[PDB]
Structure 1
């Protein structure tokens, strides 16, 4: 259905695409610098949908290697 670039027609946003290109760049630095940029790759938060006013579901996230490359 959608029309756009190769990420947009595949169900991937720009933020998911452009972080993958930043995720794959950080892996191929020097180990003085790859261990530095390993810090800014970790994603640790949680989210939960709130439907009624205080009840939710909670979608706890977790990833140290970067953006999930798989389709979510």
Structure 2
């Protein structure tokens, strides 16, 4: 249904695509530099929608290896 590159037609945005190619480059770095690249790979935040003004559901990210490869 989308018309564009191979990530875009498969529903994936460019931001998740280019971070996947950034995630997979860090997995094949040398170990004096692979563990320090694991610092810039971790994703720790949380989000919450606000449909009415004060109430909302929750979502928690606690990843330490990179952006999720599977579908969000």
TM bucket normalised to smaller: over 0.9
* Residue-by-residue CA offset, 1:10-63 (whole Å, 9 max, x unaligned): 010000000000000001111000011010000000001111001010111121
- Stretches of structure 2 that go unaligned for 5 or more consecutive residues are none
Please report the TM-score for the alignment, with normalisation by the length of structure 1.
0.97
Runs of 4+ in 1 over 6 A off after TM superposition: none
Tell which deviates more after alignment, 59-68 or 14-23: 59-68
Q: Normalising to structure 2: TM-score of the pair?
A: 0.97
Higher deviation after alignment, 60-69 or 12-21: 60-69
For structure 1, list consecutive stretches of 5 or more residues without a partner in the other structure.
Answer: none
Higher strand share: 2
* Count of residue pairs the alignment pairs up: 72
Distance in 2 between residues matched to 1:58 and 1:50, nearest whole Å: 10
